[model samples]
Target: HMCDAFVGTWKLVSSENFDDYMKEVGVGFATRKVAGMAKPNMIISVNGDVITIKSESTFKNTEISFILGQEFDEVTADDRKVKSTITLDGGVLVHVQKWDGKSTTIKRKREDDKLVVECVMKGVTSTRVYERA
Candidate 1:
């Protein structure tokens, strides 16, 4: 499996500077306050060449499926409709989304048996750690 390193369910263990990162992504103030407190669990799986990512949380539960390098329409947690794409860069999973002329990048990498998610919006970068569930 090309993505064996990330093919599992992961629970968010900690997040740092996500509030500001969400703000930069234009998440509403109230929504940020509410969703900020949530730690989402992600399920990653692959069948054929299609990858499925299920994000589970009290704030929002969203699932997505796409082939690597394929672009698709995605609705975000805060309801931002964006054009999204996922691709493997080096060994990292790179997710890019663009909406309202603004864009953000999320990089997921496996390190030391853990998944580290790095969210970047404009200049603010947030780090969220996840562990196997």
Candidate 2:
């Protein structure tokens, strides 16, 4: 199924409008610079009703573990504390986060051997592509 398809490691290939999206998310200039220079890698795993997403980069490393449709606290890469929920829709993993009443949505999907991550915040969108590693 889709979860099985998503269980693998992916390396960042390219990103579009990521700097602008980080700015909209209130990430500081210095942090944005570091983030922009980093090629983050993702490892996804699924076990029963739980999923784990591990992000690794020279700038930072973060792992999130959650159950589908369950809300939990999340500390973002830029150190923002927020509430997040994750759900699977069709073949996509949809994640929604709220911080200071503002919301951001991230969608992850697989296209052939590539992984596509779309992040939206304050109407600004960033698309990051990854290839199976």
Candidate 3:
């Protein structure tokens, strides 16, 4: 039921403090500046134990597909190659990525008809809200 709830094509409604979060995550200035201006739609789909999450935008598109709780290689939107793992916790999907000695965590949860994605690195947190489109 929790996993089923995340299946949808969701449009970006709003984002908060994303540039700061990206800076904390060690992203380059050019990519961070461009990414801060992007309004990306999120697409989520599930098959068996595997889940694929895609972020589509006019600037760029990035997708990550992995089995629940299994770590895999991910090349992030900012072009960072990291080890990533995603796990379902209640109604939230927790995604964690690590590169070198650095790490970031992103949590996705649905509230009413909106999907709220929270990205965190160290103490900085950026929130992106999406609604089905």
Error of 2 at 109 (Å): 0.8
Pairs clashing within candidate 1: none
Of candidate 3, the 10-residue stretch with the lowest lDDT total is 1-10
Local accuracy of candidate 3 as per-residue lDDT tens digits, 22-127: 9898889999888888889899998888798999998889998899889999998899999999988887999999999998999999899999999999999999
Ranking, lDDT, top scorer first: 2, 1, 3
lDDT of candidate model 1 versus the reference: 0.93
Q: How do the residues 41-102 of candidate 2 rate in per-residue lDDT, one tens digit apiece?
A: 99999888889999999999999999999999999999999999999998899999998989
What are the Cα lDDT values of the candidates? 0.93, 0.94, 0.91
**Model 2: ten consecutive residues of lowest lDDT:** 1-10
Q: Say which prediction, candidate 1 or candidate 3, comes out ahead on lDDT.
A: 1
User: By summed lDDT, which 10 consecutive residues of candidate 1 come out lowest?
Assistant: 1-10
User: Residue 89 in model 2: shift from native, Å?
Assistant: 1.1
Instruction: List the candidates' TM-scores in order.
Output: 0.97, 0.97, 0.96
Count of residue pairs whose backbone atoms collide, per candidate: 0, 0, 0
